[PDB]
RNA sequence: GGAGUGAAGGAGGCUCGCGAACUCGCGAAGCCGAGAAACUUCACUCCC
């Protein structure tokens, strides 16, 4: 829809047709976080499961190496979401958290799930745009 | 692109306007939000 000049300047810093690496994304976080507070960094993943069946639910917990324990539970549309840190954190701590969340999802891959498990993975901030990442990077 | 729905983030968001101890701070300036609802993100469903 219609966005303001703060967000439109954030879109002139990202490439929609580029699969970023985890280290590139974590370094990009500070530039994509321009709201008037310390924003939260989020990881979103579209899962390769059938969310209409009860046996393919992805629901667990994981202790991130920088910050406490987080909870993750897939939605009925098939996607999964989790806060992985704040935007004032050093890039290496953010990249370590993104990697820890990815492994945690992959440790709870259900039987009966078909094909690629992490179909798309994105990194974004609270009030900013997203960047698609390679989860195996 | 439009109308909705779900989850997750979330205490701010958008528009203007000046001011110099540093992309930052102020304003009895309007509107929206701190209610599920702003704003942002991944998805889902329908429509030209
Ligand atoms: K967001």
């Amino acid at each position: 829809p219609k966005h303001g000049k703060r967000y439109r300047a954030l879109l002139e810093k990202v490439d929609p047709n580029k699969i970023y690496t985890i280290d590139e994304a974590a370094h990009l976080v500070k530039e994509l976080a321009t709201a008037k507070f310390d924003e939260t960094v989020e990881v979103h993943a579209k899962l390769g499961i059938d969310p209409r069946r009860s046996d393919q639910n992805v629901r667990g917990t994981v202790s991130l190496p920088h910050g406490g324990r987080i909870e993750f539970r897939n939605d009925k549309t098939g996607a999964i979401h989790a806060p992985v840190g704040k935007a004032s954190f050093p890039p290496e701590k953010l990249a370590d958290n993104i990697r820890a969340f990815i492994r945690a999802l992959e440790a709870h891959k259900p039987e009966g799930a078909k094909g690629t498990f992490l179909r798309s993975v994105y990194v974004t901030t609270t009030m900013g745009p997203s960047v698609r990442i390679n989860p195996h990077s």
Side-chain angles (χ1 to χ4, degrees), chain A residues 23-64:
Chain A
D23 287 22
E24 277 174 332
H27 283 85
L28 200 45
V29 161
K30 279 277 190 178
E31 300 289 329
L32 301 182
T34 53
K36 306 179 184 299
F37 68 105
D38 194 14
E39 304 189 41
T40 302
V41 187
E42 309 158 24
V43 175
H44 299 263
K46 174 56 168 174
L47 298 172
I49 57 175
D50 189 340
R52 324 285 185 189
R53 24 252 303 162
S54 174
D55 54 318
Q56 300 185 24
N57 288 347
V58 181
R59 190 172 190 175
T61 46
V62 67
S63 190
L64 299 182

Side-chain angles (χ1 to χ4, degrees), chain A residues 5-16 18 20 24 27-34 129-131:
Chain A
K5 70 178 179 186
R6 180 204 61 87
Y7 178 91
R8 290 191 308 262
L10 265 27
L11 277 192
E12 294 281 339
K13 205 172 304 177
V14 294
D15 189 27
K18 184 179 185 298
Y20 287 79
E24 277 174 332
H27 283 85
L28 200 45
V29 161
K30 279 277 190 178
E31 300 289 329
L32 301 182
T34 53
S130 68
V131 278

